């Protein structure tokens, strides 16, 4: 199954954050879809879900700001939150929720089958003059599938694409048979950026570091890869930076010195 979130990575304060989840592999009319978020370094927070019948449930502390919509034909769920503040900067996940209705009788009461069957009775020895009631159905929920999530930043500062500079290997950056090389992704906003190497064909020995917020207010990070030193004249190495907040993709050839 697949759940893909989409929307703006940057929302100005007091504006309305809006995200859309495109679904495939379960039909939006059978299973129910919910939204979960998590602020950086905080715990998961339930935002709400929409039932197959179109009914919506919201978190009690955020219902005045939330709103979920459905479109079964296009298979798209929508989430909205008004008066977006800096506390709303988080990663927003699109999920599928699964329910499970359990029937039960009130306390002390018993079923007719355990002794007319579906009803709960007050006395099984009589099963006639005893008081009769209906069973109580209560359902529980668990999240089954999670989307990759979308990092949303609530800020007044403006988007800025990244500058990509090469971290080239030299006669001092080597370590015998292996050499380290990378590219520096400088001055971008907001988060995040994604780096690969040779269009994903180079995954062995790759690491991308967490970003850092500079004094200028922009983010920067690095991505490094270790390759055989004997290949620095035969194999070309390209780092593929991706910045969805600005719809920018940069391919930078790393040349040995």
């Amino acid at each position: 199954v697949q759940l893909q979130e989409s929307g703006p990575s940057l929302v100005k304060p007091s504006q309305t954050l809006s995200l859309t989840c495109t679904t495939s592999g379960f039909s939006l009319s059978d299973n129910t879809v919910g939204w979960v978020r998590q602020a950086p370094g905080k715990a998961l927070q339930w935002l709400g879900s929409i039932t197959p019948s179109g009914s919506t449930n919201y978190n009690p502390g955020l219902k005045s700001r939330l709103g979920i919509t459905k479109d079964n034909s296009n298979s798209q769920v929508s989430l909205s939150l008004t008066s977006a503040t800096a506390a709303d900067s988080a990663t927003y996940y699109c999920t599928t929720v699964h329910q499970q209705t359990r029937k039960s009788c009130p306390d002390g009461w018993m079923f007719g089958f355990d002794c007319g069957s579906e009803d709960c009775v007050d006395d099984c020895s009589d099963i006639l003059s005893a008081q009769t009631l209906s069973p109580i159905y209560t359902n529980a929920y668990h999240v089954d599938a999670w989307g990759q999530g979308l990092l949303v930043t609530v800020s007044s500062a403006s988007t800025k694409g990244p500058s990509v500079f090469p971290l080239a290997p030299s006669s001092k950056s080597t370590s015998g048979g292996t050499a380290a090389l990378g590219c520096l992704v400088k001055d971008y906003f907001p988060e995040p950026v994604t780096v690969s190497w040779n269009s994903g064909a180079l995954t062995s020995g790759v690491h991308t570091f967490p970003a850092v917020l500079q004094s200028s207010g922009l983010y920067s990070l690095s991505s490094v890869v270790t390759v055989p030193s004997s290949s620095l004249g035969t194999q070309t190495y390209i780092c593929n930076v991706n910045h969805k907040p600005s719809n920018t993709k940069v391919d930078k050839k790393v040349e040995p010195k």
């Binding site: 500058s163 500079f165 080239a168 950056s173 380290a180 520096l184 400088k186 690095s222 490094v224």
Partner: peptide
Amino acid sequence: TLFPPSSEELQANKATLVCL
């Protein structure tokens, strides 16, 4: 590994040393 500022960054009037 300590990378000096690249020629590209120097041509942009900036200089960042990267220690990995």
